[PDB]
Ligand SMILES: Cc1cc2nc3c(=O)[nH]c(=O)nc-3n(C[C@H](O)[C@H](O)[C@H](O)COP(=O)(O)OP(=O)(O)OC[C@H]3O[C@@H](n4cnc5c(N)ncnc54)[C@H](O)[C@@H]3O)c2cc1C
Ligand SMILES: CC(C)C(=O)C(=O)O
């Protein structure tokens with residue numbers, strides 16, 4: 001970047017909020033994935049939406065790529081500056097506004113995390129349910145289309161994003177559903193909000209998200225259930241879903257994952273395990289518990305090991321499964337798969353994935369949101385063993401392709417980033433790809449909005 005351009009950036013956001021220092025750029029050139037760090041040419045922290053617009057306009061008209069950056073917890077290299085450019089760290093815009101408890105809605109800026117929002121909402125009787133394991137920006141969660149353990153009951157970001165404020169690549173300000181609007185449903189025009197959820201910073205910069213809030217559950221009960229086999233745990237999961245038990249959380253861990261979590265946090269039996277949580281009244285909980293225990297017993301599940309103090313450490317361990325897996329081989333990095341299949345095909349593909357991990361030399365732990373037909377294989381890689389990273393690539397792709405063969409998707413929540421671009425082309429085919437590209441081209445004609453990602 002030229003010095004004239006850097007001074008132009010400083011004129012918008014202020015000297016302290018522009019950095020070309022190598023260390024600062026390197027810290028903003030990677031996320032939590034194994035994708036190689038690719039430092040931006042500068043990092044910029046805009047202080048308000050007017051500054052975001054003016055930084056975007058400056059970059060766009062100068063031919064400088066723009067990389068939106070939230071909390072950097074992505075796992076597909078979304079923030080990697082594969083063509084250099086300006087990294088826009090959005091987290092100094094950190095205010096919660098328009099809290100409408102009577103309407104179950106709130107507006108958050110990119111610096112607001114889920115933990116910050118729910119702390120703000122303590123004693124309101126309301127909460128925000130979508131719970132990635134990481135302390136992630138809620139606008140980043142909108143950008144990636146995130147879900148979490150609670151999604152099986154309370155929905156994904158796509159279900160819970162009501163409106164988005166977006167700075168388009170050339171600086172124009174769009175409110176996808178209209179400025180200040182919030183409602184339960186609409187047929188007015190084309191739904192622009194859903195286009196920008198899961199766009200990963202390639203269609204514009206999300207500067208606020210309007211979120212659906214939910215009432216806190218009347219009562220909660222959590223438990224773990226150990227099984228003799230992966231087959232038994234996943235069969236139980238499918239049968240719980242087909243019996244329409246409204247479980248709040250149903251999380252799978254294989255024996256490797258359970259052992260890793262034990263060592264990193266817990267003392268559960270080392271076995272394929274379900275972490276379960278139920279919401280309702282006492283009578284409603286007792287009914288759900290009886291029907292769920294009946295199904296798990298049919299498949300050899302243990303009596304439920306019951307679990308606020310215990311409950312929080314249970315889900316804290318689950319939320320840290322990524323780091324528990326990494327701790328199995330200190331110094332390694334990791335790649336997560338994220339396929340999601342029709343639920344009736346979930347037993348085949350998890351059992352097959354377990355057998356393929358056993359039969360390979362790779363270290364993999366299995367965990368995830370099986371209530372959605374979704375799961376993660378966390379594959380460890382030595383950053384210096386290029387042959388191991390080739391085998392982890394080949395394994396991840398082969399699993400992705402098996403998911404596509406079963407009518408599923410290559411990613412349930414993490415997104416495409418740099419890692420799944422070929423799988424996406426296979427998933428939606430030539431007309432799907434061209435349509436997606438035409439949408440990208442109308443919003444970002446010069447191709448400067450986070451280039452090299454998704455498409
Ligand atoms: C331990 C751990 C557990 C995780 N668990 C989950 C999980 O359960 N579910 C899940 O879905 N993900 C999970 N993730 C992945 C990650 O937390 C989510 O993808 C999260 O939504 C990323 O948000 P971020 O702001 O940190 O993203 P970043 O890494 O900052 O960015 C991600 C992508 O979105 C773009 N982007 C970010 N902010 C904006 C914005 N405001 N406007 C436009 N584009 C933007 C970036 O350019 C990039 O392409 C986990 C990650 C870790 C490390
Ligand atoms: C494995 C990580 C990336 C995750 O998404 C989760 O904890 O569910």
Ligand SMILES: [Mn+2]
Nearest residue numbers: 148368369413
């Ligand atoms: Mn997940």
